[PDB]
Amino acid sequence: SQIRHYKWEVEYMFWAPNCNENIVMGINGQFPGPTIRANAGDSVVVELTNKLHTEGVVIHWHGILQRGTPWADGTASISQCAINPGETFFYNFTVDNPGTFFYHGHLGMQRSAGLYGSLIVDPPQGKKEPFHYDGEINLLLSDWWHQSIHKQEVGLSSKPIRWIGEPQTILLNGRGQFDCSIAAKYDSNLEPCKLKGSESCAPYIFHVSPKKTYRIRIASTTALAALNFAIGNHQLLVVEADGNYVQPFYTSDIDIYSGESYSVLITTDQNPSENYWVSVGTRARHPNTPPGLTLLNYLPNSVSKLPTSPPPQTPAWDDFDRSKNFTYRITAAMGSPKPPVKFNRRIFLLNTQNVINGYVKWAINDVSLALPPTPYLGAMKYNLLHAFDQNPPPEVFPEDYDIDTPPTNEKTRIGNGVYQFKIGEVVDVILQNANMMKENLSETHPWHLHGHDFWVLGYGDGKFSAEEESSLNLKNPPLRNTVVIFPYGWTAIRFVADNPGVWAFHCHIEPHLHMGMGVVFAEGVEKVGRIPTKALACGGTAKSLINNPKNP
Amino acid sequence: SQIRHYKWEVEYMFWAPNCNENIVMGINGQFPGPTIRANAGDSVVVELTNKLHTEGVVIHWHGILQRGTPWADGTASISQCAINPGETFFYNFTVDNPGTFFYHGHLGMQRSAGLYGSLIVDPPQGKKEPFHYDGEINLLLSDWWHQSIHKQEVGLSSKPIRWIGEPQTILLNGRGQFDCSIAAKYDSNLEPCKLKGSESCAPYIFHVSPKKTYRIRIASTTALAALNFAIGNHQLLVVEADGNYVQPFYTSDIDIYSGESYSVLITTDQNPSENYWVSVGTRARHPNTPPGLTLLNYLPNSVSKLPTSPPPQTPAWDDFDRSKNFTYRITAAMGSPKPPVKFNRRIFLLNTQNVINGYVKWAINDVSLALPPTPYLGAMKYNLLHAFDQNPPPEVFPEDYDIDTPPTNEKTRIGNGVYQFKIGEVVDVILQNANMMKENLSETHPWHLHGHDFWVLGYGDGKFSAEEESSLNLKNPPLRNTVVIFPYGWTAIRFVADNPGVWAFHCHIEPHLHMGMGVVFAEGVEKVGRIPTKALACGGTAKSLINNPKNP
Ligand SMILES: *[C@@H]1O[C@H](CO)[C@@H](O)[C@H](O)[C@H]1NC(C)=O
Ligand SMILES: *[C@@H]1O[C@H](CO)[C@@H](O)[C@H](O)[C@H]1NC(C)=O
Ligand SMILES: [Cu+2]
Ligand SMILES: [Cu+2]
Ligand SMILES: [Cu+2]
């Protein structure tokens, strides 16, 4: 096992992701940030200096379990106090298992401004992957707004709310095109982009040789968009989902929601004299954004040799039946860990959009999360019982709640209590979707749990009821970190609370998390060891720990 | 009989349709134009003074037949030379029959710049309409882009074409809202408009008293948009269409294409304690323009009192079956003129989108119309055989043409020939739609005939064949001046060549007309009397009528 050491500075810079200049949050002058790659078993050490002028910052490693290092999770106000300007924090953690992961900002809406990058983990040195491939292509998907994130943050916190709107561009490895299309030769209404390929917004072309097999690692850090990925004329075979192996299956395209990572295999068994289209189209919301496009360039053909066909037409945004047909087909690879069969706790969380005191907020069992200035992990290790609400948050919603109609908002509160588990508890979480404030509307929401992987026991329509117990999958369920709830539906997951620390479980659409959509889980905090001083040096933790008497 | 005399000037002026300033082409300092209201059989005299600085102007009176006065049709290069800066021209014509008509610019793309207004002809002095209502409401629908018309015109003439795009705002009597909605109440994702009622973009409210019946006259002069009109909780009785009366029927909403006019009657039956929404939304093209909205305000309710329901959602833009369902009902009122049973001429017109010398043009049986600088009416009266092509234009297309494939463009040319008819011929026209340049696309095209009304004999899908004859409605066919062809279909119409003149028959979507989609019909030109000298004063007619010898 090696120690992989990175030394990084976060700083804003001018950049033009879609050839339109704005400021982006860069790491060591790069947008997207540098790739961390390691082998399972290695220690990763990142010393990060903050060089934003007035802003704190933190970096979360999405999908890394942080087992034994809960202080390195990178979530402001839950694992640590943010890192102040001009200061340096060390994130030292181990990578336990292979898979496609990524890292991103977790303080405010800093991740929509560009703070993200890939973190890939390979098998232990000497071991090999269960499947063979010749080459690898890595792809990080995100979305881009031309508006400042500091104005987006303010507009989402105003009465009337000012929603961020659909993004302007879909970004493939940090690049995209606004107001022109690289596939404009198939439709005279489209404006041709003039690009020699040397520009910051020039497509990242996938180069493949004939008759080979390639692993395409795909990860999503979209702030809002749900995407559909298809290459013209090529079957995709799914082999990996969120750092875990799934039972292989072919599909013509995959849907990917923010927080998910997949690895697909392709074989370049097509006509070798032409190049093919890669389309990343928006679904689950009425599209207002052009698709992200690039070429699968069969070498030696000139990359300017355009495909004979158009890009694959993206599937209808609202055909949720086609989306469930994909999602329900995902099962654990033969030989994967099977769940505990009985649970020790089952919690029900109702997801609603609400209007609290004029403000539109998202609530979970009528509590919209407002994170405290004291980091929960420090607060609970030092038993600071005034830092947040000690009263246990609701583990059930009312059976007279009608999920087909707008909230009444009669009892909706903002809060910051923590669900607490005992070390070793098996927990089931049933996520229940409902109608939003507008009549006859319910949306998809990706939910991601920090510091754990869970088994996806099942999905259903309407409200979960006891009749649905026998449909939950206990033989084959997939292990994931991100899961979706569909319009008016439920999704059930199970996990063992075996990892000491305080972990966020939240919706991965960033405006939703900004508006309160997430909860806090804590387990076995009695067993957490020493926390770095910098993760404690704010709020009530620094108040009790800094000895500064008076008269003494 | 009575003469209605108007003293008018057209000048560009600064104005803000949707509260965003731009320049608008206004008449006597106002946008939209002044309404002309007269009774059938009166004589309208308009002395227009062109107050533009470097441009010519013409006004066309859409729907009026120009029976006896072909020189006042107001089509530059067809009935007249355009009126030069600082000059005054007289348009004197007879309004023959009651109905809802309008007038609009007909030189270049000047109508999209705001040059249009209403022309309502009431029954003969002392006669009554064949139905009863207590009031009427006049609505003129149009659409508005934020880019210059002169930059739009250069973009459609460029190689590569810059398509003008979907309109920014739908206007209801010249007002509309952009980036905000007066119906923001029902949706947190919409922005409220901050209007007091006094503004240039504040909605024209429809004031009604309860338990009364009204005639809402609706006309379309849109450059591009096909719209659908609907009133919350109110069914519509269709009683007039294009100045003619139809067999009455009920409907929840009407589709209106550019160039069409309708009168619909409503009765204020509904609950008198509230207001109801008027919604005019986009159909037949994928929408990317919010609907135009206003209120049916039941007096004495406050106009600030919103409806309980959202606006009616516009029917799906691409449900062409629902569209045909409405379109195919329209039948002439009993008592209307039946068509000649036998025809004397039948022409077949293939509507295609082509690429001529790298330019994207529209064409009819492979000729894209380029209008000459000599006005056709003057050229043909004075028998100037060198002013245009005297070869008859193509009257049939190849029956082997695949209307489901992009055009090859092989023989597609630009030209300016004229179809000539004998004074009295009963002419049949089958308009045939086909696939455009993009694979798998055909669009709707509103066709308008000048100086005539025609009977709509029928519509069908695919290619017209002779075996189609028994479906043609010779019994009840509506009398209209505009008719749509649907994607991949034909429409057949019949009219009588009985009005001496040169008349345009074109697509009423202004960009397509700019791109060549239209043809010219001339009949009985040797029966035309004296043409006004200003209408002759350009091109070949000026050259051949100004006596200016040399040596003298
Ligand atoms: C993190 O790693 C660095 C380098 O090995 C070390 O100096 C530092 O003390 C470590 N801190 C923690 C909290 O492990
Ligand atoms: C048009 O009508 C006006 C007013 O009667 C008259 O002065 C003018 O000469 C007429 N011109 C034509 C061409 O009829
Ligand atoms: Cu759409
Ligand atoms: Cu969400
Ligand atoms: Cu057209």
From Swiss-Prot, chains A, B:
Residues given in the record as Cu cation 2 binding sites: H62, H104, H508
One Gene Ontology cellular component annotation held by this UniProt entry: extracellular region
Broad class of the protein's primary localization: secreted
Cysteine disulfide links: C19-C201, C81-C538, C180-C193
Cofactor(s) needed by this chain: Cu cation
EC numbers for this chain: 1.10.3.3
CDD domains cross-referenced by the UniProt entry: CuRO_1_AAO, CuRO_2_AAO, CuRO_3_AAO
Gene3D superfamilies on file: Cupredoxins - blue copper proteins (2.60.40.420)
Annotated Plastocyanin-like domain residues: 1-122, 134-300, 344-523
A Pfam family matched in the record: Cu-oxidase_3
Binding site for Cu cation 3: H106, H450, H506
Reaction it catalyzes: 4 L-ascorbate + O2 = 4 monodehydro-L-ascorbate radical + 2 H2O
Cellular localization per UniProt: Secreted
Gene Ontology MF terms in the entry: copper ion binding; L-ascorbate oxidase activity
NCBIfam families: ascorbase
Subunit structure: Dimer.
Similarity comment text for this entry: Belongs to the multicopper oxidase family.
Biological role: May be involved in a redox system involving ascorbic acid.
Descriptive protein name: L-ascorbate oxidase
Protein species of origin: Cucurbita pepo var. melopepo (Zucchini)
